[PDB]
């Protein structure tokens, strides 16, 4: 699995690690999955629709497990940087 | 004033496992943000494909050292 492509992550104003939006990324013709344990955000469809360059919603932190961003209860002010 | 909102957000979630010979790589080198989950450097193959490399592995440090001195 040639799944070693870089991918855009989301930042936050909380001073914690950048996190993948969900647990999947496209790389060299393959739908790749982040490794189990990897930090992620699990956003609702509505939250993704309005995601922008500053936080405007409380973003659920999660941990990737077999492709699912399993929420852990921590909430962060996440945003995307173009 | 908070900083770190200005960090770049491209990160490597997986690495190339096996060593890639230097003849297959270009002169491209980009260090990812220290805010990324995993410390990584991005190289580019001669087919213009960006690849994630782990700078704790010895061949990666070797290639970066080679890229330094011309």
Residue numbers in the entry:
A (entry chain A): 22 to 103
B (entry chain B): 1 to 70
Article sentences:
To achieve this, we mutated residues Tyr44 and Leu39 in the CC + 1 binding pocket to Ala and Pro, respectively; Pro was chosen as it occurs in the corresponding position to Leu39 in several class A3 evasins. We found that the Y44A and L39P mutants exhibited increased affinity to most chemokines with aromatic CC + 1 residues but decreased affinity to most chemokines with aliphatic CC + 1 residues. In the case of L39P, the affinity decreases were only small so this mutant bound to 21 of the 24 available CC chemokines with affinities tighter than 100 nM, compared to 17 chemokines for wild type EVA-A. Consistent with their increased affinity for chemokines with aromatic CC + 1 residues, both the Y44A and L39P mutants exhibited substantial enhancements in their potencies for inhibition of both CCL2 and CCL7. In addition, both variants inhibited the receptor-mediated phosphorylation of ERK by CCL2 as well as by the same eight chemokines as wild type EVA-A. To validate the structural basis of enhanced binding and inhibition of chemokines with aromatic CC + 1 residues, we determined the structures of EVA-A(Y44A) in complex with CCL2 and both mutants in complex with CCL7. Identifying the structural origin of negative energy contributions at the CC + 1 binding pocket enabled us to reprogram EVA-A as a more promiscuous CC chemokine binder.
Evasins are chemokine-binding proteins from tick saliva, whose application as anti-inflammatory therapeutics will require manipulation of their chemokine target selectivity. Here we describe subclass A3 evasins, which are unique to the tick genus Amblyomma and distinguished from “classical” class A1 evasins by an additional disulfide bond near the chemokine recognition interface. The A3 evasin EVA-AAM1001 (EVA-A) bound to CC chemokines and inhibited their receptor activation. Structures of chemokine-bound EVA-A revealed a deep hydrophobic pocket, unique to A3 evasins, that interacts with the residue immediately following the CC motif of the chemokine.
